Paper text:
F1Fo ATP synthase is a biological rotary motor that utilizes a rotary catalytic mechanism to couple proton translocation across a membrane with the synthesis of adenosine triphosphate (ATP) from inorganic phosphate (Pi) and adenosine diphosphate (ADP). The F1-ATPase consists of three α-, three β-, and a single γ-subunit, with the α- and β-subunits arranged in an alternating manner (αβαβαβ) to form a hexameric ring with the γ-subunit at its center. Moreover, the β-subunit is the principal catalytic subunit that undergoes conformational changes and, as they change sequentially, they drive the rotation of the γ-subunit during ATP hydrolysis. Here, we exploit temperature and time-resolved cryo-electron microscopy to determine the structure of the binding- and catalytic-dwell states of Bacillus PS3 F1-ATPase.
Moreover, imaging the same reaction, at 28 °C, would produce a structure of the enzyme but in the catalytic dwell, which could be used as a direct comparison to understand the molecular basis of rotation in the F1-ATPase. The predominant cryo-EM structure of TF1(βE190D) obtained when frozen from 28 °C was almost identical to the bMF1 ground-state crystal structure; two of the β-subunits were in a closed conformation and bound to MgATP (akin to βTP and βDP of bMF1), whereas the third β-subunit was in an open conformation (akin to βE or βDP of bMF1). The structure of TF1 obtained when frozen from 28 °C likely corresponds to a “hydrolysis-waiting” state where the enzyme is paused just prior to hydrolysis, representing the motor in the catalytic-dwell state. Although the structure was highly similar to the crystal structure of bMF1 in the ground state, one clear difference was the βE nucleotide occupancy. In the crystal structure of bMF1 in ground state, the βE site was empty and did not contain any nucleotide, whereas the equivalent site in the cryo-EM structure of TF1 contained MgADP. However, an exception is that ADP is observed bound to the β320∘ site, whereas previous studies, based on information from the ground-state bMF1 crystal structure, hypothesized that this site would be empty and not contain any nucleotide. An obvious alternative explanation is that the ADP observed in the β320∘ represents ADP re-binding from solution, with ADP being generated by the enzyme up until it is frozen. At 200°, the catalytically critical arginine residue of the α-subunit (αArg364 in TF1), commonly termed the “arginine finger,” is in close contact with the γ-phosphate of ATP. The hydrolysis stroke occurs after the catalytic dwell; MgATP is hydrolyzed to MgADP + Pi in the β200∘C site, resulting in its opening to a half-open state so that the γ-subunit is pulled towards the β200∘C site and pivots around the β80∘C subunit with a 44° rotation, MgADP and Pi are exchanged for MgATP in the β320∘O site, which reorients to a half-closed state primed for the ATP-binding stroke.
Residue numbers in the entry:
A (entry chain A): 26 to 499
B (entry chain B): 27 to 501
C (entry chain E): 1 to 470
D (entry chain D): 232 to 471
E (entry chain F): 353 to 471
F (entry chain G): 232 to 287
The structure:
Amino acid sequence: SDVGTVIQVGDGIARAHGLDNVMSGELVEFANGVMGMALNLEENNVGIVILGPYTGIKEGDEVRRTGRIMEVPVGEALIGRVVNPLGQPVDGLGPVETTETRPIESRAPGVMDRRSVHEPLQTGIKAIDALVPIGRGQRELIIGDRQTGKTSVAIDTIINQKDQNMISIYVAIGQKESTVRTVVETLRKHGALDYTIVVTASASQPAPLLFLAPYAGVAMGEYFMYKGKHVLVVYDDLSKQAAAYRELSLLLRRPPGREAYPGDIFYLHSRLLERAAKLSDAKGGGSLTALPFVETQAGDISAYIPTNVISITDGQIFLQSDLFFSGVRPAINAGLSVSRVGGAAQIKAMKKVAGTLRLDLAAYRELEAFAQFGSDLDKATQAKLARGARTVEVLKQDLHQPIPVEKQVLIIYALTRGFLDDIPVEDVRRFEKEFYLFLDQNGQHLLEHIRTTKDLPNEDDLNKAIEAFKKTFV
Amino acid sequence: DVGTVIQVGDGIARAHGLDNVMSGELVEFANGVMGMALNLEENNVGIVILGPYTGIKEGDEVRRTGRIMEVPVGEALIGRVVNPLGQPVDGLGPVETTETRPIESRAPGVMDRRSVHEPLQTGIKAIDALVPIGRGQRELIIGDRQTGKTSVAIDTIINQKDQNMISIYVAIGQKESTVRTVVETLRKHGALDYTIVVTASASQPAPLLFLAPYAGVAMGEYFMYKGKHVLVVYDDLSKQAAAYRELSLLLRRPPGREAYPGDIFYLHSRLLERAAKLSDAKGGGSLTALPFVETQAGDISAYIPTNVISITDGQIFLQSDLFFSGVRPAINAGLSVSRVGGAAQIKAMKKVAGTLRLDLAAYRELEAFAQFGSDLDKATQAKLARGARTVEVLKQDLHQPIPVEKQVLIIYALTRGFLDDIPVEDVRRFEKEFYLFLDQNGQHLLEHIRTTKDLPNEDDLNKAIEAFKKTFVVS
Amino acid sequence: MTRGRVIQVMGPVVDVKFENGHLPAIYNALKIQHKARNENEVDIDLTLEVALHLGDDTVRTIAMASTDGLIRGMEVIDTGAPISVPVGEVTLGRVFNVLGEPIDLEGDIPADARRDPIHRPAPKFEELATEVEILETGIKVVDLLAPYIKGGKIGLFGGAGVGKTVLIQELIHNIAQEHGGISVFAGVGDRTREGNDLYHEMKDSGVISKTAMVFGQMNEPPGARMRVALTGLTMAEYFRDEQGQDVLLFIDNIFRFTQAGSEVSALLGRMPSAVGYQPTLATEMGQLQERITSTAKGSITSIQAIYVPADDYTDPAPATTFSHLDATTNLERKLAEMGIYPAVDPLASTSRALAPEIVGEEHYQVARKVQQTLQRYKELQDIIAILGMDELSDEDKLVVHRARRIQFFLSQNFHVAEQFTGQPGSYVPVKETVRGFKEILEGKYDHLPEDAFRLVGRIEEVVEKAKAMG
Amino acid sequence: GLTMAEYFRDEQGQDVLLFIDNIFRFTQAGSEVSALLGRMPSAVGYQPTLATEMGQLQERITSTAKGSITSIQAIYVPADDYTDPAPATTFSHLDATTNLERKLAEMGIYPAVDPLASTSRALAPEIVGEEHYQVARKVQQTLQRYKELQDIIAILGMDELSDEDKLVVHRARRIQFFLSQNFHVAEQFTGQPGSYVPVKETVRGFKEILEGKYDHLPEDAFRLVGRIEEVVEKAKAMGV
Amino acid sequence: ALAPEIVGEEHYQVARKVQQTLQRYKELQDIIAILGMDELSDEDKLVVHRARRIQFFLSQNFHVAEQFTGQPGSYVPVKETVRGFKEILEGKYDHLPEDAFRLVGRIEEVVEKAKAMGV
Amino acid sequence: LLDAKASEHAARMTAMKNATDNANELIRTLTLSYNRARQAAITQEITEIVAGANAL
Ligand SMILES: Nc1ncnc2c1ncn2[C@@H]1O[C@H](COP(=O)(O)OP(=O)(O)OP(=O)(O)O)[C@@H](O)[C@H]1O
Ligand SMILES: Nc1ncnc2c1ncn2[C@@H]1O[C@H](COP(=O)(O)OP(=O)(O)OP(=O)(O)O)[C@@H](O)[C@H]1O
Ligand SMILES: Nc1ncnc2c1ncn2[C@@H]1O[C@H](COP(=O)(O)OP(=O)(O)O)[C@@H](O)[C@H]1O
Ligand SMILES: [Mg+2]
Ligand SMILES: [Mg+2]
Ligand SMILES: [Mg+2]
């Protein structure tokens, strides 16, 4: 029948006897009102994961079948609210008042139902827009050690999308509840909360809800994607999801692997990260795009969960601790950051300027790793080294201040074409600022064209404007 | 004596009954596929399936053969391609054997053995001169991938035509195309008329690979106790170790270093210690074995490599950088040794070349120092000149063995210094020409070494080598 | 007839009980197709592969699609046979999943198609071929400096953005055009953004008409991902067994076949071996590679990409895979940046056919010299990087000259390149490249502008292309 | 301890301090009882529920709208391995962290605090001021440059290098020793009585070291001293 | 049995001084692996010369080695072994080359083995 | 002085060539020790895990 009884209770796992018609993945309801999901079905024992406080469930208490597969509430009313992984409001402010539901175990968009990533996501970070392009419908990994910039890089991305016709979701997994509150008040101050959803899974909660938290977040975004608006999703640690599945499995007594991890780990992460796509014109041209985060201990890029997330994505941004403690900020290592969907997600103007820089930074990393100290080497080697330092000062940027794309292409045009040779390395950070002021007051004509035609204006006019400013600068 | 299968998974089954079954017995399923009984728990016998396991299902009818693991032996096996079980593979019909032997024989005990007093001439200049092997020895060929391992063994079997030896080749874990190819290569050189090739290629269940080396020695011991000398080659003992770990970790036996079940040493020794030189009371027979082990990173120092370096009476280490530097066969003199060697050389060869193995290691270091070195002295420069010629005198070509009387004559030239006059590239051609000249002109020297295993009068030999050097021309 | 019923479910694993004791064999396949009785239920259309006979008339099974939504007691039926996919001319120009269903919206393959098993006993020693033969690919660098072999396993190690997809497509075109043989592409664990781009490029390059493709996605449970290589294989077996033509099989990354095997060994409850890998690594790897053989009728040759797990070639996945490989082709980015396509590094690529018994003596001498010439130039490159060209000794200049021409004559104009460029392209027979490189190494053609050798075919083309400049 | 502090925070409403000594010994106890409770093992012999227990305890130790708990903890790094699960799981809960290193304790630089691996959410240009932040990050560049340069010195030798590299090693030695201090609880361990340095003074002094004003003094004078004034006198006794 | 009373003070002082030279050269070995002996100065140079002498003078010719190498064996009584090390440690045999110190029994044998070379 | 300065510059250049060649050889020898240690650490942790799991 549809009623069973609990026999073992412990650590957020219970075991039931009966409940013969249950499905794998169902929702089940205990007497206390706490809900649960069936993940195992042996011949005499049904295995239950509890999705709530398990200090009131006693042995012999009843458990009853809902009849629904696991479902997350969706609707326009969720925008601007702080919510649980289950559709339950947390900020106070009353009910969420949703209209309908979606499964959290959706199938991904197939081949023949997808298109090719062809449009940009302007992050407003000089290094991320120029050097490591993310295009709508890609999966981008931010992988790095603790204390290197990470939440800083995602928060800058949401703000710099204010003008653009975008929807953004933040999925905070395993984080201390005062830290989630610091990001939210911060977003209310920048006016960001009006078009965003924060989904929260604090460190006090049963592991199972941390596991569902990334799935609930994509299940909310896919509703808007199939309706046609573009959407962006950030997961605040996939390594903290991977820990909570291992705990649930080892209490369900399933067999171990490399580091106590269940044999499903590639299947769990892949099912979540392939629900990112650019749908085609028949599907209405919507798009998800995804930003998983992974934290690596002593930079072990070879660990089990890190080897796995470096593979499923369409690129990586590896961040290094020594660059940070050396003034390079954001601390993005150019050698280990690659985008395999690169070359299509930039505006036409930026593609021409960005190509030279990748070659320029490389010819410095090789030369500098040996010759910075040598007082005099060949005249070329001096030329490459000098533009090498200026490039690493043009890529430096401040916290919580994104830069619009037209200004990025202009500063990168000037460094690449040699206008910035005369300027010393220390004042490159100020020549930048003075140039932005001069461009606004005087050069309105050049900025008009790049935004509208994504294209670069006539060289003589650009050379004239930049050469004239070089006269003004002191 | 009847039981019933309860689990049939991964190549190991279990069966309920078979009351009088002896341990080690061959077991027949209802299907007619074979198996080995290895364990007897109180209600259940534990069976290893020695064949494809996808036709056996719970409910089948395993039956008892009545015989301990037994391999078929007889003279009819020579010249046939066979399975580890006595089953013909080449086509060509039945093997038509007469009798059987256990695959779990005891090794000839102490007081049933003797010391080695006859050579196993390989026709390879570096192995015969520097690292000698005699009948009854156990010698390890160690190296990395693509270094020359199969090439050294096959050169040995062809050259063991002239001498009255039986040779067995046991291919463990090898790709099937490489094996079919070796049989056609042996048929072309006429070798198959006196040999047996035993095959356990990679698509088969791991039990017939594990038994494959024990069937090969079981065929060779029949001939050994009847008095005729025998040689056995094992094509990968490190692939035998891998298949034993897989069978053990499926029976839930606890692991160890790497994941190797501790019974790796016992496995390898049980096989290698049946090689023996029987004494005159036993009729003076001999086995000899040349096991092969592959090593990761071309590093001598690792678990399975060191374990077989323990059971043998020497080792021949082959190096990958020597192989890519034109030295073929690629033999490291410093790390390669023979422990029963010193008695296994003919008298002329002991006198000619015993200080070559140690002196040649000294050149290897002094060359390495000299390249980075700026200015050398006269006694270092003279040593550097002889070392280069020795390395070119030890270079050979594939499938071309050199008779032992011709070996001692070319080595006499180098050690006594006649080859010092000739520029280096010419050394290989000087060696082909001297062998032709010996054939056409110098027959008296070649008659003396064969009968007395002994070197002729020094005046006559010095005369002859000067006479050849007049006829030779340069560049 | 008879039927089973489901008695346990855990992730990808399921157990079925067959009460009469009439049970399925170890690699047979089972269907669940069920219509929902009440609105609480979810309709299901799953299939399962057998793995172990546990006892008590029960069988352990791995699942090929998502197992979410399964009720205990749900009925289940046995097909009497392994997974079987359609073979013949029907499967050319189409895309299919592991089961054999068509993923393309190009109709459905009919019932009458002959369907043959994924799992089959391997080829025998009375059936193979005694003498090695060399396969002429029409590509200059590959045929000269790392000859491919009929019945061989070739390995591609290269970085992203070096021409992999172009080299695969040109090989498929040359074999179909000149040697008259089809190809198969089996993508083991591939990202669904790459499958779409590949189908569009295979169609827009015109190559599609001669190839059949199997895609197994990353989002599938491990068993489906593992057996995707075994269906691409069984399709190429019909073309060698019956049509008798030679066939080519491409595998997207062999590492994910080994990873899927590890993940299935963990679900099934087996004890891990060294570096946490399955206890049956070389019996799995061998049972794939030992079907890629040159039988008397015809041959299968395979180009397989491999990922080095940590930049460690001493690991148990590289160890077992490199045991089977006969040639290794490595693609370099520096060459690509400079303008050389195909971008294959002459000095890091190997073959076991480059020995004078197989290739013949003229080919061996010509090849070794090319390697000797290029390596010496790599040395003078750091001297020329620090100081001036005049500084080199005269003999050293006579090696700089030949190396620059040799490096360029390796470059070739492909036919699939005409979508990325505006020139027709050429195929070179092995005798013509061996003759030509002998002329360059004797210096007969040194009175020539350097760029005359760029993206050209036979050596006589250089003569005419020179005249074009003047 | 926490229930007592909670009553003082919530009902009385006074602000409160909590000192917890070795919170690792809480995590370690769970392991001992895990096997006898019937739990399967995880990672490096740890409980299958490590994050869950650390979260329950730590998420109670907070400063609410009613009142504030400042909480100060010692955390034990289980086998000198900061990559262990118990410390890694702990780093996610703090607002400010100092990591102590045995290599510094061997050199005798007490307190032995890693100036790079230690971090706080209060080192932000508006939370501490522009003058403070400038000096702080500039010290962190000097000490990261000294770390890479020590490898080159150890094999090739110090005289081989440039004037800018020499001046980095000069200043980095002084900065690293001037981070050491004479405490009142080190009265028992070192004889000397002890010092309290106000924040304004610390910024002045570290700025002088970076600008090179005090580079004439010998380096041993900077060890176990509190204010920069003292360092001048300590040198006088030596005779400089 | 290495204690002043058991061995005598002369043997004890000789054994400890030999073990001190060998430990210094197991630390110098990390720098001479890369640069060679140009980096070494003063005491480093003298210590490496004497360590090379000591390490080869601990090697011997055995009667059981006759089945492997044609040389005869040697038995060195204890009073002789101590005397040789002291002359090596003092520096009385600094002039003789390192290849003359290998596979010998007593210090007299090193002098005749050097004289055969003439180096 | 002409000969002295010329000979000093050449002496540093070979000393540097040999020093670099010794360093690169040490890097391959050390790299292999790291990979052998890394693979042993991953086979110990999995055997302790499975030893406890088999007991319970
Ligand atoms: N671009 C930047 N410029 C200056 N300071 C920065 C920049 N990005 C980050 N920071 C600073 O460095 C630290 C970055 O902390 P952040 O939370 O971004 O890193 P995290 O990796 O999320 O940390 P955790 O591992 O604790 O989650 C903070 O002190 C922050 O103010
Ligand atoms: N002396 C030689 N002269 C020339 N070529 C040789 C010589 N010895 C071997 N070769 C060739 O070099 C290659 C060596 O392959 P071989 O099978 O002998 O090595 P292996 O170590 O057994 O290889 P694997 O590890 O693949 O089993 C073959 O091409 C062989 O023919
Ligand atoms: N043979 C060639 N001729 C001309 N251009 C080529 C050739 N091969 C590659 N390219 C250029 O380099 C690109 C490499 O793309 P592709 O091979 O798909 O990269 P990947 O190796 O990542 O699959 C081509 O799209 C084209 O721009
Ligand atoms: Mg964070
Ligand atoms: Mg071989
Ligand atoms: Mg590709």
